[PDB]
Amino acid sequence: LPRLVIWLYQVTQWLTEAEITTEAIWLLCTPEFSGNISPEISNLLNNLR
């Protein structure tokens, strides 16, 4: 529990210093995907093929 507390404090301090929101940092930290093909991916296909 104290390890989690100190990790959370350091993470929040660094995040506030970097001035990043919550869902944005979620997306830019997790390796997950949106769920389907994005319009940008479709444009990449249509400009690559």
> Which residues are near another protein by CB under 8 A?
39-40, 42-43, 46
Q: Distance (Å, rounded) from C-alpha 39 to C-alpha 36?
A: 10
Please name the residues in contact with 25: beta carbons below 8 A apart, sequence gap of 6 or more: 15
Q: Distance (Å, rounded) from C-alpha 24 to C-alpha 17?
A: 15
Would you say 3 or 40 has its CB closer to another protein? 40
How near is the Cβ of 40 to another protein at its closest, in Å?
A: 8
How near is the Cβ of 22 to another protein at its closest, in Å?
A: 14
Would you say 2 or 47 has its CB closer to another protein? 47
